[PDB]
């Protein structure tokens, strides 16, 4: 009949793929995913808000602050709290840093998943400096919680923005050298141009989000249409793709890195010295000096860490432009100290839904290039 290959969990991420292929050029591929299933939604249902914030930190794991930002803005949207301006600007700066990190890992792991070895090492030296910044800010290497609902917790120490300025200059030169290395590299252009075309009608019906909508025509940015924070005050532009190519989508990711450099530059130049957290002791914990020499601050610290703050009853769905796309969180909260049911819209899940139309008329090396060309981490796809 036809060859029903079973690509197991070995490395060409981690999945299982059963492809009923015709003859080096396929027929019917089915991704069996769910191998990395953990039980995040049931665990958040049996825990509180502040305690189950790290589940939202690590359900996606390459992006590490946009997922925190999405859950914290879900809770701050439901709880009716505007965060202070310096918290909003630090949240914007770290959103752009995490965006730069996720796009550069997607570029390098797509290059290594094809087989090119060296810009992986170059840009991972750059991402080692990124993790040095995360270490100095929070204390963690990767999984900095750091974003409480109620603003940024424990603001950045003195002597950081100069290092971010130096990193901005050197990283602009390094991404220019990446475009020098690849990108009009002839064999790589031969590797990926005409594979995985996506009609914009199918991009809307199959529910593609983020970079796929940029590549397949239609102009759609959450940062431009629905400013959920101080993005309306920083000036940037989004790149759009003419043809539905993979090469086009690569160019779009590189130019989103470059626009992240612009937003980091303006955010450094326009920092207000407002405050760390909100002006409400019943949501954010009070600082430790007032805790020690104050009665009400000790009472609010004690109850706010045992019971937690309550949330008024209601349901909300917010979604922010994570580097993979519209990362969505839908909270349903009975009026209590625990959420009733949370659910996560994953752009990687929505992109992996259309794998049939992205790999109908191509070969299997192009199937590996299609799996690589969408920033799919297989921990977020699981929910």
């Amino acid at each position: 009949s036809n060859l029903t290959l079973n690509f197991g969990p070995q490395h060409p991420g981690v999945l299982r793929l059963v492809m009923e292929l015709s003859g080096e050029m396929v027929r019917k591929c089915d991704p069996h995913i769910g191998l990395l299933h953990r039980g995040t939604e049931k665990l958040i249902e049996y825990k509180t808000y502040l305690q189950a914030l790290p589940y939202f930190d690590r359900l996606d794991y390459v992006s590490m602050m946009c997922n925190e930002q999405a859950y914290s803005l879900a809770v701050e949207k439901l709880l009716n709290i505007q965060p202070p301006p310096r918290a909003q600007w630090i949240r914007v700066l770290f959103g752009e840093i995490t965006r730069l990190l996720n796009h550069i890992m997607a570029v390098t792991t797509h290059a290594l998943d094809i087989g090119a070895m060296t810009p992986f090492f170059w840009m991972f030296e750059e991402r080692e400096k990124m993790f040095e910044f995360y270490e100095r800010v929070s204390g963690a290497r990767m999984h900095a919680a750091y974003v409480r609902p109620g603003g940024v917790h424990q603001d950045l120490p003195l002597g950081l923005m100069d290092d971010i300025y130096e990193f901005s200059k050197n990283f602009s030169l390094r991404i220019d050298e990446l475009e020098e290395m690849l990108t009009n590299n002839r064999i790589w252009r031969n590797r990926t141009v005409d594979i995985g075309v996506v009609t914009a009608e199918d991009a809307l019906n199959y529910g593609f989000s983020g970079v796929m909508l940029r590549g397949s025509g239609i102009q759609w940015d959450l940062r431009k249409t629905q400013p959920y924070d101080v993005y309306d005050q920083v000036e940037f532009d989004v790149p759009i793709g003419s043809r539905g190519d993979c090469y086009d989508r690569y160019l779009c990711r590189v130019e989103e890195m470059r626009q992240s450099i612009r937003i980091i530059s303006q955010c450094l130049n326009k920092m207000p010295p407002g405050e760390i957290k909100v002006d409400d002791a019943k949501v954010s914990p009070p600082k430790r000096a007032e805790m020690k020499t104050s009665m009400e601050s000790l009472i609010h610290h004690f109850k706010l860490y045992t019971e937690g703050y309550q949330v008024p009853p209601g349901a909300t769905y917010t979604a922010i432009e994570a580097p993979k796309g519209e990362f969505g969180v839908y909270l349903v909260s009975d009026g209590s100290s625990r959420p009733y049911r949370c659910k996560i819209k994953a752009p990687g899940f929505a992109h992996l839904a259309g794998l049939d139309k992205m790999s109908k008329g191509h070969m299997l090396a192009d199937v590996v290039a299609i799996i690589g060309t969408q920033d799919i981490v297989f921990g977020e796809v699981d929910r």
Partner: protein
């Protein structure tokens, strides 16, 4: 103009008469809809207003930026989709009264 931005949307060549025959078909199939429903009123209102915008345009870009709906062929796809739901809503009779109610102690949230 040539090669608009959307990928699987190849360009049109005659916008005016194609969109006019689309909306005459809209008004025909909507003429087969019963009268006392609100749906006939709202659809016939918005389609006559949109066609009356279309009736007096010599240009292309002026019609694109003046008539909302944005890009010129997405309007045509939108019109084809509205004709498809008009054919579907000849069936399904949605203007009839409500189907059987829930147990009414249900849509209250806080449990």
């Amino acid at each position: 103009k040539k090669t608009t931005g959307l990928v699987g949307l190849a360009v049109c060549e005659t916008p005016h008469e194609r969109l006019k025959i689309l909306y005459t078909k809209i008004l025909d199939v909507l003429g087969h809809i019963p009268k006392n429903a609100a749906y006939r009123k709202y659809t016939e209102q918005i389609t006559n207003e949109k066609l009356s915008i279309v009736k007096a345009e010599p240009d292309v870009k002026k019609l694109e930026e003046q008539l909302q709906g944005g890009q010129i062929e997405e309007v045509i796809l939108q019109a084809e989709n509205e004709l498809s739901l008009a054919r579907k809503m000849i069936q399904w009779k949605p203007w009839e009264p409500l189907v059987e109610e829930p147990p009414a102690s249900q849509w209250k949230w806080p449990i």
